[PDB]
């Protein structure tokens, strides 16, 4: 696997300061390495609508992956994103979909009360993808790329190098 940076940039009212206790780095305050949990700058102000696009200039196909976040209480979502009806859409020259956040009472789990679901799509050479969102987007900051071929093995036993 290889990598290429997104190049994405965000406005003054968008940030990536959100941190979760469920992930283990230097005391707990951290998040995934290559995804950004966008939230509003100020408290009590809505998430601004922003359009973002990505270009592919490599001679090979890529694999862009992102996620959407499901709050677990009405008291939660308004603080993070705002009081409007959130919605996001994704469109390439070969892909088209739409998602919507939703909230409701849910169980407790090892990390907080909430869920996030991830999505992915393939991108072709000379092809672009576009993201339209105003909240709930776990926007990637670095994208992956796959090359060559390998062999997957799934077991549990000591390794031997001789």
């Amino acid at each position: 696997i290889n990598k290429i940076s997104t190049g994405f940039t965000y406005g003054s009212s968008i940030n990536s300061a959100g941190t979760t206790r469920a992930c283990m780095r230097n005391g707990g305050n951290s998040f995934y390495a290559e995804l950004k949990w966008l939230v509003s700058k100020s408290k009590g102000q809505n998430f601004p609508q922003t359009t973002n696009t990505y270009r592919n200039t490599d001679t090979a196909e890529h694999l862009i992956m992102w996620g959407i976040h499901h709050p677990s209480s009405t008291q939660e979502k308004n603080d993070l994103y705002g009081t409007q009806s959130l919605s996001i859409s994704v469109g390439s020259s070969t892909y088209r979909n739409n998602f919507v956040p939703v909230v409701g009472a849910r169980p407790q789990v090892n990390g907080q009360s909430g869920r996030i679901d991830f999505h992915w799509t393939l991108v072709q050479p000379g092809d672009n993808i576009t993201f339209s969102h105003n909240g709930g987007l776990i926007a990637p900051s670095r994208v992956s790329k796959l090359i060559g071929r390998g062999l997957g093995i799934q077991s549990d036993a000591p390794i031997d190098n001789n």
Partner: protein, 57 residues
Amino acid sequence: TNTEFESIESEFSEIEHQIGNVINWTKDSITDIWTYQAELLVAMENQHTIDMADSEM
């Protein structure tokens, strides 16, 4: 015949119930084919060895 196979069944599985059944059916059918094919092949070749050796004598 150096055909190389790859996994289609996840050992730490969370699979559906329809496609799982479809994959299950073919595996047993082919497994029975190999078991039935192999058993007759060996039993069939043993007949020639006994017959051939008796002829050389």
